[PDB]
Amino acid sequence: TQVPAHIGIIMDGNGRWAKKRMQPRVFGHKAGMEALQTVTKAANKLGVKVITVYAFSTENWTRPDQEVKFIMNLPVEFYDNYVPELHANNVKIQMIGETDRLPKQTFEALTKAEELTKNNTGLILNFALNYGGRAEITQALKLISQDVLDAKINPGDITEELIGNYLFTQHLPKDLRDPDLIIRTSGELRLSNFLPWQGAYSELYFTDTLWPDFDEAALQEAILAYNRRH
Amino acid sequence: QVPAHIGIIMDGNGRWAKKRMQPRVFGHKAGMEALQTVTKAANKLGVKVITVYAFSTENWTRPDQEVKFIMNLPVEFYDNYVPELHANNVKIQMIGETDRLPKQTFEALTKAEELTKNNTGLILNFALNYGGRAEITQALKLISQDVLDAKINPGDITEELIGNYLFTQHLPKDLRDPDLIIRTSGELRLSNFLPWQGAYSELYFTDTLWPDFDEAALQEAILAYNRR
Numbered sequence A: 001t002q003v004p005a006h007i008g009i010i011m012d013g014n015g016r017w018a019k020k021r022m023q024p025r026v027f028g029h030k031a032g033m034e035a036l037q038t039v040t041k042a043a044n045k046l047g048v049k050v051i052t053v054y055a056f057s058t059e060n061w062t063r064p065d066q067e068v069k070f071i072m073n074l075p076v077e078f079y080d081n082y083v084p085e086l087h088a089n090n091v092k093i094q095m096i097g098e099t100d101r102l103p104k105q106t107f108e109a110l111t112k113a114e115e116l117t118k119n120n121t122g123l124i125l126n127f128a129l130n131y132g133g134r135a136e137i138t139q140a141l142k143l144i145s146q147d148v149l150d151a152k153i154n155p156g157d158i159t160e161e162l163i164g165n166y167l168f169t170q171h172l173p174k175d176l177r178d179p180d181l182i183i184r185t186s187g188e189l190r191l192s193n194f195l196p197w198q199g200a201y202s203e204l205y206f207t208d209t210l211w212p213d214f215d216e217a218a219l220q221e222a223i224l225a226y227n228r229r230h
Numbered sequence B: 001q002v003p004a005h006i007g008i009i010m011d012g013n014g015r016w017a018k019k020r021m022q023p024r025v026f027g028h029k030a031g032m033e034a035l036q037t038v039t040k041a042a043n044k045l046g047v048k049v050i051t052v053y054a055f056s057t058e059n060w061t062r063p064d065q066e067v068k069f070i071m072n073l074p075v076e077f078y079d080n081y082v083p084e085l086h087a088n089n090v091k092i093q094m095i096g097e098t099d100r101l102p103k104q105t106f107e108a109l110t111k112a113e114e115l116t117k118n119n120t121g122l123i124l125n126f127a128l129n130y131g132g133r134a135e136i137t138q139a140l141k142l143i144s145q146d147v148l149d150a151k152i153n154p155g156d157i158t159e160e161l162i163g164n165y166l167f168t169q170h171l172p173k174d175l176r177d178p179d180l181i182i183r184t185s186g187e188l189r190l191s192n193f194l195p196w197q198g199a200y201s202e203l204y205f206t207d208t209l210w211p212d213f214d215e216a217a218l219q220e221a222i223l224a225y226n227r228r
């Protein structure tokens, strides 16, 4: 039975999860990190090659300032709780999006994890940060037109394959750029501008399970559902 | 209160036909009847646009006899559907790379477009020889040519500009993006259908096979959309 090579994950339901426990939304975001660690280690053992997680959308900047500040600080303060273990598990950490606009300490924590794990050959945990699909496509189409104008490439070179090489996912191995499966938790049956180009042919999987409750058994059920697809 | 633009991925024509001990092509003809029913009901309900995934770039991998039968459907059955849609004030349009279409198929579609071009009701938009990635790629060949000709600058390349170069540019600006995308036969994938335009769309999946999708099934989809 097939193991999806690349899984896209839209984490949802952290606030509802926390509220059921009479806790603020930020308590749910911390439990969301625990869930991501569990899922990453299990997927790596199962043979999944890439996990792209929708960590921070360009729309997430509209959340209350205190919540945005708390979120940006998570990889800074909890780096030791997760990154050395992912490294010991041979997991390679990467990121996609307009990351040059992340707060400096957040950008540094992510770059430090990337530099530490850059030679790792196991699962690639790919954080989509300051990411939007239409914006990603726009930056690709813009960079291509500039290259055509500079005569670095000619208009005859403009193909679907060329566009793929200018998307943020260009740093993933060529055969792993596109998710085989996209998971959205908390029962939301919608697209939220996550990998619209790369995920154009992806199998979709929706669960009512809130993201902090998504564990190894929930990942196994998603893979089982994926294997019953044709 | 209805979604203004509904995207429809018609699926299950073959399984529908097989349950009746009929070849897949029998299901495609019943699929046209279902589309006529859905279009007339959606128009009466106040839906502004229906974009139907009539023929994908992947559908060319089907057996030659089936592809030939499909391409002949609007040629052979034009009188069974087009005059009635026109009497219902439905405007017919198409999106996609329609140069690969056989001449008679392209002519039947253009004849329906010319007949209904002044109609002010629901726009029935056929995505034919369509693929989302190809649509975005063609938009770049056009944009790059304009940048090279100095009609525009690379600094003018924005999300708003890209939208004006997609095939959906012919729909009114506030109707280009589907509010809801429906896929029938319990298939959980979008298959390169409006990936840019549908980036924020509500999704609706049903086990109902497309030839069985009627007004009641459309009402259930609208009801589900309203609870979102």
Ligand SMILES: Cc1onc(-c2ccccc2Cl)c1C(=O)Nc1ccc(C(C)C)cc1
Residues within 6 Å of the ligand: A032, A033, A034, A036, A037, A055, A056, A071, A072, A073, A074, A075, A076, A078, A079, A080, A082, A083, A086, A093, A106, A109, A110, A113, A127
């Ligand atoms: C689980 C887990 O495993 N590795 C990370 C991580 C990876 C890189 C740097 C720091 C951390 Cl803690 C991690 C994690 O959840 N990272 C994370 C958490 C939150 C954010 C915010 C900025 C959206 C960004 C990254």
Ligand SMILES: Cc1onc(-c2ccccc2Cl)c1C(=O)Nc1ccc(C(C)C)cc1
Residues within 6 Å of the ligand: B031, B032, B033, B035, B036, B054, B055, B070, B071, B072, B073, B074, B075, B077, B078, B079, B081, B082, B085, B092, B105, B108, B109, B112, B126
């Ligand atoms: C229902 C319905 O109502 N009008 C049409 C129609 C629209 C344009 C031309 C001819 C026709 Cl029959 C129509 C329909 O099913 N058209 C159709 C059917 C099949 C195809 C193939 C080429 C995928 C293309 C268009």
Ligand SMILES: CC(C)=CCC/C(C)=C/CC/C(C)=C/COP(=O)(O)OP(=O)(O)O
Residues within 6 Å of the ligand: A011, A012, A013, A014, A015, A016, A017, A025, A029, A030, A032, A033, A036, A053, A055, A056, A060, A071, A186, A211
């Ligand atoms: C990478 C990682 C593990 C990050 C930690 C989680 C985090 C801060 C995610 C970004 C915000 C978000 C979309 C949360 C999902 O729940 P929600 O707040 O939308 O929940 P709700 O819909 O119940 O309100």
Ligand SMILES: CC(C)=CCC/C(C)=C/CC/C(C)=C/COP(=O)(O)OP(=O)(O)O
Residues within 6 Å of the ligand: B010, B011, B012, B013, B014, B015, B016, B024, B028, B029, B031, B032, B035, B052, B053, B054, B055, B059, B070, B073, B185, B210
């Ligand atoms: C516009 C219109 C009404 C056109 C007629 C229908 C038609 C020819 C559609 C194109 C092929 C297709 C994707 C059919 C869906 O059922 P399927 O053949 O994939 O069924 P299956 O999954 O059960 O095999």
